[PDB]
Design a protein around this nucleic acid. Sequence first.
RNA 1: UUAUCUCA
Length: 306
Amino acid sequence: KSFLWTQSLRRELSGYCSNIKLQVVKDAQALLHGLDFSEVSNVQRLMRKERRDDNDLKRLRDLNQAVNNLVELKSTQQKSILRVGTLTSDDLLILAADLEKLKSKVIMGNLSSQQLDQRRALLNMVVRVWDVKNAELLSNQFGTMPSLTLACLTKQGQVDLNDAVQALTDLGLIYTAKYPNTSDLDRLTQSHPILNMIDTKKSSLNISGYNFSLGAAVKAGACMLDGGNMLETIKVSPQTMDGILKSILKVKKALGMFISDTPGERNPYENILYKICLSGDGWPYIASRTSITGRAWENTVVDLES
RNA sequence: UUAUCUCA
């Protein structure tokens, strides 16, 4: 069902998808030339600690800003108000409800640097927490960005930007047919040594786009084919915003898509919905969103008047 | 609490 939703969305939204290989590669080059890959290493590590504090968060956000400055594919703060227009009044009700659903789903001791030894000893025979003053500051700092994935694969893997691009393109083609997985990645590593860098055993949840993952690599590979009607390459603007939501609603109806309740499962529908509604101006899947403040349900509001 | 891990 998941991949079916994904594919129905792709076909429906194909008109809003664009060719962005060029930009993504241009942006990767910018990062390769301008970014401090020494600090990239540090932030990678800092993000992997189980106890993470404000000093680590500040480190992450600073790096994010550095990256925001080198890249052209950004999302900008753009509040959206949805009104009865190309959107029906029933549609506003669905959206207003589903945004609420998203909101609602969102609603271990004192040591130390000895957690490192706890780990080793435990292994001898990994939930990660934040200790932060204001947790708003985590919002939008943890996303994945193709141009960044490319850059890090390239410097850290010590290969040509091109070798990375070709490898990820293969992931991208597979992705048009199925959700690539660990075995597929392993079979692809023969022809593409660079993919050894994506270690799926060592990858994890909420550790930022500076660390590698199969999911992030697939997101990147999607931007490598100038076609495929990949959702990743969708651009949103204030004009095109309603048309996109309406097209999504049409698929939602047709396939009976919905927002899950189980906190762990995040599906094609809630993914595209949260991503679109975060800002009415950017590339919802693949841009630099570190500048954005707030969540989708705050940045997009429904207006039942009429 | 992080728009992210892994999975059909």
